[PDB]
Enzyme design. Structure first.
Site, PDB file in Angstrom:
ATOM      1  N   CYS A   7       0.876  -1.242   0.000  1.00 31.53           N
ATOM      2  CA  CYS A   7       0.000   0.000   0.000  1.00 31.53           C
ATOM      3  C   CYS A   7       0.882   1.251   0.000  1.00 31.53           C
ATOM      4  O   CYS A   7       1.746   1.117  -0.822  1.00 31.53           O
ATOM      5  CB  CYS A   7      -0.911   0.026   1.196  1.00 31.53           C
ATOM      6  SG  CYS A   7      -2.520   0.765   0.808  1.00 31.53           S
TER       7      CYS A   7
ATOM      8  N   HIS B  97      -2.733  -5.617   1.712  1.00 32.01           N
ATOM      9  CA  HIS B  97      -1.840  -5.756   2.863  1.00 32.01           C
ATOM     10  C   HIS B  97      -1.617  -7.181   3.390  1.00 32.01           C
ATOM     11  O   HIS B  97      -2.354  -7.630   4.282  1.00 32.01           O
ATOM     12  CB  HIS B  97      -2.361  -4.933   4.024  1.00 32.01           C
ATOM     13  CG  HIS B  97      -2.253  -3.455   3.844  1.00 32.01           C
ATOM     14  ND1 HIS B  97      -3.306  -2.694   3.386  1.00 32.01           N
ATOM     15  CD2 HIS B  97      -1.270  -2.584   4.170  1.00 32.01           C
ATOM     16  CE1 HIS B  97      -2.981  -1.417   3.446  1.00 32.01           C
ATOM     17  NE2 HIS B  97      -1.749  -1.322   3.918  1.00 32.01           N
TER      18      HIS B  97
ATOM     19  N   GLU C 125       0.781  -8.198   5.190  1.00 29.77           N
ATOM     20  CA  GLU C 125       1.395  -8.067   6.502  1.00 29.77           C
ATOM     21  C   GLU C 125       0.379  -7.884   7.613  1.00 29.77           C
ATOM     22  O   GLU C 125       0.696  -8.078   8.787  1.00 29.77           O
ATOM     23  CB  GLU C 125       2.395  -6.905   6.501  1.00 29.77           C
ATOM     24  CG  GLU C 125       1.793  -5.497   6.607  1.00 29.77           C
ATOM     25  CD  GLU C 125       1.451  -4.866   5.286  1.00 29.77           C
ATOM     26  OE1 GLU C 125       1.089  -5.583   4.334  1.00 29.77           O
ATOM     27  OE2 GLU C 125       1.576  -3.627   5.195  1.00 29.77           O
TER      28      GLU C 125
END
Ligand SMILES: Nc1ncnc2c1ncn2[C@@H]1O[C@H](COP(=O)(O)OP(=O)(O)O)[C@@H](O)[C@H]1O
Ligand SMILES: [Mg+2]
Ligand SMILES: [Mg+2]
Ligand SMILES: [Mg+2]
Length: 1286
Positions: A1126, A1251, A1253
């Protein structure tokens, strides 16, 4: 532009088109319906640059390049009348602060200020001067903006004003009549006893009070500030009362002090957490390590009611912003984790979607409508929560406006002055919970943004700069992360009253005094008076005390984070406050401390009780069938998607339970659950209980129902002891209005002295708003809109096991639906959703029938959550049992076959009562043991067997041989969705709003599904981690990045040594990229997305020759890897000229929906040379999406066809059916061919908008199959990085 501007120059630079297709078509449609014949309208962004020094050719080209951003929409040649919309003069916009930041970090110090405006080119022809004001009126916000006729007229926005002198009030010369004139002039609104004190105090001091001292006093002695009503002595029905409202709330702490660490001592409350691994970057090494220590939970809930009625966006934004400050400023420093948003308004009255209960009762010209608050308000609140980086995980939204027969007879009850609720949790270290002692000579600093004249409708218009608060939070963070070396002795937030309340409070709570200097405070508008510099309510500011020798450490920390700070004063031994002005050589303030905290007669409220009668429901127009249709169409009951997807729900990677539930992402989650860290299953839990319309019939019941609903909404989580749940009581009332006062006492007594001490529930925090009414002239008569006694209980709790939380998602497996009716068959219909929906108030309302059974209910629920005996849970709130079973069937995408025979003969009452409890789903084989357990807690006379969840679309409610209600579950699903659909139509792109709605009508939607090409549990990085050799990864961040801690935790699990690399660390020449073989550009809102998302970050690299070279050498090296999730995807896609094999890469611009999309979208891994996606190709898994500027944009079809041919696409959005789709929201941004990930030719650098993560942990996924281990499939990206480096 170099048009005359004092000693400076004003520069006019053109920009891209401001409005996209549908926005222009809506404006033309809005002009037609006002008899304004406008043929065409074109909008264009135009920039204004105030330069102090000259600008050379290289620097000019660099300014033009910073101002080239956003969507590449086709520009038109200017034609027609020019109408320029810029902010009001004397006002600096949040865009201006963030755009100028970029100029300074790009080496253009010649730029003083950068302001934007929108130039409108109207080809209308033949309009009278009146009709032109009507056109101009539709193109600007009268509270924040102004209209100009020339681009050169924008010189007014940058005028240098001379610092105004301090005014004096001649008390010694004119008498008391000088204070009467000042109370009227300055607008101090003081009482008679207050003006008496001010006369005596200054006669004692023997001098004339300065206007600054008088204004400060007003801000310090206002009812809200001193909490007058809550501390007041009471006389109910000619009988004196023992305790105050505050003392009654304190009784809950005296009877249950359990697990509380700090209560009523701070501007928040702290409770016990769990011993988990707190993850952060070490101050010395820069490495991100797991610190095994107690992570205690903090909480606070605020209100910002009046500002939201005048200007919705700022009122909602600064509402969450001030609350985020309260959290960070707890003790000696703390960190905000998650948040809750709340709203209460009048009737929406959506054009072309009017409801049968909605009536136009007028509204003040000065305030905005309920609909405008619901369009611009949630967006403002989300704007702060998104840009700062805290997930908005739970909340409420209620609508009420009706001519009801209440406590003061027939009158209008509603919320023209709304409830704007903002709250949340946070984590704090054990040795930081308590405030440290302030030493004599302690340096008093102001951490935060340069002040402006904000808090003095106009003065009720606030300002939100969330990136400024992120930077400030990162300073508070580096501080508590220093352990016992934390510089912060004391920290307080700035809010109501500005610095005039914050500073004398910081030193007062420390027992010291303070000497200040007005010219040491950072100011963004020179012309301010000492009154304005010290009393303004400018945002994103904190006040703190630091030791003199800890000052060089604080400077080092603040400068690295780019957070503005200023040492304004010193703490003193003597109890005295003093402000000095170096510019005028005088002293604006010179007062003893008690003179400010000065008391007068304590308030006494001698009130009478009033009680409503209200007749029984008139069932003439009521049929169960129409009742269901009408109820699902009530905004309070209806789908809340327009409030959920606009705000981030995945940041910090600690989110377990968000609003969206199941494969169908239905927003019906009863509470919110977060994990305490990134290495445990312990956590936090948030719920909201509120039942305000009940206060129109019974004051004590509404209060009790709020505690009850909070408890029933929290019940599906593994908490354990009830004494673990901590409450927050926010009270909304119209103090003075007949019957409300005496009813406020009975409501506070009902929860403070009775219900909460009986259950073991503590109320360690709260707040109050005591003037919930609005007055105006309609015709010649005076109209009032009074709010019901609105108690909003927010329950907070420590979780034992995050994994064991239950959702409303029904299972089609052999089951049994059991209802726990805590209402004991009372089946009350008064003040329900059903009653409101039929323009009525009703007879008798719901209440906590048996105290021991509500406790028994919770204890039973906990017994079943731990023993894993439940399949699903959903409580009974708005719209009764019908809405509970409907929302359960929506979440499970199945049918329901229930029998309500043993629920009384009144079917309407059995189905629509808002009594406590709900429906639990168990396995068919487990029905007997679960009923027996529920019986052990004395709930046998409450537990009724309803039926079973079946596979299908049939929603059937029976009563013996008769059929009560039968309808298609999809028809109800769509009806329930109709309100959010209509809200997205007037706010977002109608094309997108329609596509989201029409996909719900397809019963064949399989929901989110998984297809895996590799083994999810095979840790391919294991042989590498086992050698002990851990390669370092540069976890890159710029000011305004928030998704970096979890990014570091993701690479850490893969076997990396994650290091914190700030852009300042590279620009300051501290860290170099030569020692790294892996770099990751993180997600967030760098520079608040201003000048294009990720463009300011990339251009601060590109324009700085040394850092530009440092990055190019990195990408051009043979053995290096790079990731850009992002924001950092947007940054790296703007760094194309530095990365090899990135010639065909696209840009990421504003979404087709023109809205922030916080989704859990389904992607597929496509064939690409991507080294971070090896072994994953062909897989289809859900991913965390949180972006507003992620739409892939190509220059032409040649660019897209070439990108697809080079095979650089890594991830594509797919629908639940499996095909690559450009349909919303399966594809949240509108990207051509569903692209959200591209790579390079060699495949070493990979950029993506989603995302991975934030979802590397199975518990961090909104939905996941019931067999997945600890790791999600996204954990493989990071492991692929480790295996590739060797
Ligand atoms: N203002 C809001 N902001 C964010 N989420 C909201 C808001 N209002 C409601 N929600 C979410 O919508 C869902 C349903 O809301 P609602 O039915 O009012 O709550 P409840 O389950 O107590 O009856 C919940 O998940 C809730 O968290
Ligand atoms: Mg609710
Ligand atoms: Mg509920
Ligand atoms: Mg509900």
């Amino acid at each position: 532009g170099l048009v005359p501007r004092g000693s400076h120059m004003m520069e006019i630079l053109r920009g891209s088109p401001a409005l996209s297709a549908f926005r222009i078509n809506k404006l033309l449609a809005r002009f037609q319906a006002a008899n304004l014949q406008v043929h065409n309208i074109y909008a264009e962004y135009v920039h204004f640059a105030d330069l102090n020094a000259p600008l050379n050719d290289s620097e000019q080209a660099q300014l033009t390049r910073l101002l080239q951003y956003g969507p590449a929409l086709s520009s038109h040649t200017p034609a027609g009348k020019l109408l320029l919309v810029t902010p009001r003069p004397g006002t600096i916009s949040p865009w201006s602060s963030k755009a100028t930041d970029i100029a300074h970090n790009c080496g253009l110090q010649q730029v003083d200020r950068l302001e934007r405006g929108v130039a409108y080119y109207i080809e209308a022809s033949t309009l009278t001067a009146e009709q032109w004001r009507q056109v101009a009126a539709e193109l600007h916000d009268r509270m924040m903006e102004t209209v100009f006729s020339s681009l050169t007229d924008a010189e007014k926005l940058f005028i240098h004003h001379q610092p105004a002198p301090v005014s004096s009030v001649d008390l010694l010369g004119e008498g008391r009549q000088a204070l009467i004139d000042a109370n009227l002039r300055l607008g101090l609104a003081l009482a008679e006893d207050e003006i008496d004190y001010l006369q005596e105090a200054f006669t004692k001091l023997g001098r004339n009070p300065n206007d600054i001292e008088l204004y400060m006093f007003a801000q310090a002695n206002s009812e809200h500030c001193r909490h007058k009503i809550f501390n007041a002595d009471w006389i109910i029905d000619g009988k004196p009362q023992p305790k105050s409202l505050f003392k009654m709330i304190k009784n809950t702490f005296e009877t249950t002090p359990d697990y509380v660490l700090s209560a009523y001592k701070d501007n928040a409350a702290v409770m016990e957490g769990s011993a988990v691994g707190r993850y952060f970057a070490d101050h010395n090494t820069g490495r991100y390590d797991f610190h095994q220590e107690p992570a205690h939970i903090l909480m606070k809930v605020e209100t910002h009611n009046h500002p939201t009625a005048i200007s919705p966006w700022p009122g909602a934004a600064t509402g969450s912003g001030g609350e985020i400050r309260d959290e960070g400023a707890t003790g000696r420093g703390a960190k905000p984790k998650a948040g809750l948003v709340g709203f209460s308004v009048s009737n929406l009255r959506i054009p072309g979607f009017e409801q049968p209960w909605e009536e136009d009762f007028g509204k003040p010209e000065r305030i905005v409508t309920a609909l405008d608050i619901m369009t611009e308000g949630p967006l403002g609140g989300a704007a702060f929560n998104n840009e700062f980086g805290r997930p908005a995980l739970t909340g409420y939204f209620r609508t009420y406006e009706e001519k009801v027969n209440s406590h003061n007879g027939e009158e209008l009850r509603g919320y023209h002055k709304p409830i704007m609720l903002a709250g949340g949790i946070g984590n704090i270290r054990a040795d930081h919970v308590q405030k440290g002692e302030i030493v004599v000579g302690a340096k008093l600093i102001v951490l935060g943004g340069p002040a402006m004249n904000i808090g003095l409708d106009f003065a009720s218009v606030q300002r939100d700069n969330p990136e400024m608060e992120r930077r400030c939070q990162e300073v508070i963070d580096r501080c508590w992360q220093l352990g016992d070396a934390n510089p912060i002795l004391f920290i307080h937030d700035v809010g109501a009253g500005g610095l005039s309340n914050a500073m004398p409070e910081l030193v007062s709570d420390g027992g010291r005094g303070g000497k200040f200097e007005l010219r040491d405070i950072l100011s963004d508008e020179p012309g301010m008076s000492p009154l304005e510099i010290w009393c303004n309510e400018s945002q994103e500011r904190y006040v703190l005390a630091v030791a003199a020798d800890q000052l060089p450490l604080f400077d080092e920390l603040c400068k690295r984070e780019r957070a503005p700070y200023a040492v304004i004063g010193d703490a003193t031994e003597e109890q005295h406050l003093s402000l000095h002005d170096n510019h005028f050589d005088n002293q604006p303030i010179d007062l003893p401390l008690d003179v400010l905290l000065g008391k007068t007669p304590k308030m006494t409220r001698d009130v009478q009780t009033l009680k409503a009668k209200g007749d029984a429901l008139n069932r003439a127009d009521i049929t169960i069938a129409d009742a269901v249709k009408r109820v699902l169409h009530l905004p309070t009951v209806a789908e809340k998607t327009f409030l959920v997807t606009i705000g981030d729900r995945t940041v910090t990677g600690m989110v377990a339970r968000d609003q969206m539930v199941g494969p169908w992402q239905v927003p019906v989650a009863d509470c919110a659950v977060t994990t305490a860290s990134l290495d445990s299953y312990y956590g936090e839990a948030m719920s909201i209980g509120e039942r305000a319309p009940v206060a129109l019939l019974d004051f004590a019941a509404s209060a009790r129902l709020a505690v009850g609903e909070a408890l029933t909404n929290i019940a599906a989580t593994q908490i354990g002891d009830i004494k673990r749940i901590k409450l927050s009581a926010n009270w909304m009332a119209a103090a003075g209005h007949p019957g409300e006062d005496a009813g406020l006492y009975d409501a506070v007594k009902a929860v403070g002295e009775e219900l909460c001490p009986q259950l073991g529930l503590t109320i360690p925090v709260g707040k109050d708003s005591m003037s919930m009414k609005t007055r105006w002239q309609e015709g010649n008569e005076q109209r009032e809109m009074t709010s019901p006694l609105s108690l909003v209980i927010s329950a907070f709790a420590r979780v034992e096991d995050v994994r064991h939380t239950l959702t409303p998602q029904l299972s089609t497996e052999d089951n049994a639906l059991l209802l726990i009716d805590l209402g004991k068959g009372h089946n009350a219909l008064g003040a329900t959703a059903l009653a409101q929906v039929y323009r009525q108030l009703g007879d008798k309302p719901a209440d906590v029938r048996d105290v021991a059974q509500l406790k028994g209910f919770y204890d039973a629920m906990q017994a079943l959550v731990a023993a894993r005996k439940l399949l699903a849970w959903h409580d009974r709130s708005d719209g009764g049992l019908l809405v509970t079973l409907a929302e359960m069937a929506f979440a499970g995408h199945c049918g329901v076959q229930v029998d309500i025979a043993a629920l009384g003969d009144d079917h309407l009452a059995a189905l629509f009562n808002e009594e406590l409890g709900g429906v639990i789903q168990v396995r068919a084989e487990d029905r007997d043991a679960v009923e027996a357990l529920l019986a052990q807690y004395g709930l046998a006379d409450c537990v009724h067997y309803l039926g079973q969840a079946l596979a299908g679309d049939r929603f059937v409610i029976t009563a013996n041989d008769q059929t009560v209600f039968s309808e298609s579950r999809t028809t109800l699903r769509v009806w329930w969705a109709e309100t959010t659909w209509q809200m997205q139509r007037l706010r977002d792109n109608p094309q997108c709003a329609d596509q989201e709605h029409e996909a719900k009508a397809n019963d064949t939607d399989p929901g989110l599904n998984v297809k895996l090409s590799f083994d999810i549990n095979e840790d391919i990085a294991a042989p590498y981690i086992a050698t002990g050799a851990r390669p370092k990864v540069a976890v890159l961040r710029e000011q305004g990045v928030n998704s970096h801690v979890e990014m570091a935790a993701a690479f850490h699990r893969a076997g990396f040594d994650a290091i914190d690399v700030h852009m300042s660390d590279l620009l300051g020449g501290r860290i170099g990229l030569g020692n790294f073989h892996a770099l990751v550009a993180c997600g967030g809102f760098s520079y608040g997305d201003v000048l294009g998302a990720g463009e300011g970050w990339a251009k601060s690299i590109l324009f700085n020759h040394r850092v530009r070279d440092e990055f190019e050498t990195f990408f051009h090296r043979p053995q290096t890897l790079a990731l850009g999730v992002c924001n950092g995807c947007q940054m790296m896609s703007n760094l194309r000229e530095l990365i090899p094999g990135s010639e065909l890469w696209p840009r990421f611009v504003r979404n087709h929906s023109d809205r922030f999309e916080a989704r859990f979208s389904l992607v597929e891994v496509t064939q690409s040379p991507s080294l971070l996606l090896q072994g994953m190709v062909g897989s289809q898994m859900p991913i965390a999406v949180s972006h507003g500027e992620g739409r892939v944009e190509v220059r032409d079809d040649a660019h897209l066809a070439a990108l697809e041919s080079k095979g650089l696409v890594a991830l594509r959005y797919v629908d639940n059916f499996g095909k690559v789709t450009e349909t919303y929201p399966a594809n949240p941004n509108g990207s051509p061919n569903g692209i959200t990930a591209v790579t390079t030719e060699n495949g070493r650098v990979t950029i993506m908008m989603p995302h991975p993560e934030r979802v590397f942990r199975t518990v961090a996924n909104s939905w996941h199959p019931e067999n997945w281990g600890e790791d999600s499939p996204w954990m493989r990206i990071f492991r692929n990085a480790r295996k590739q480096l060797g």
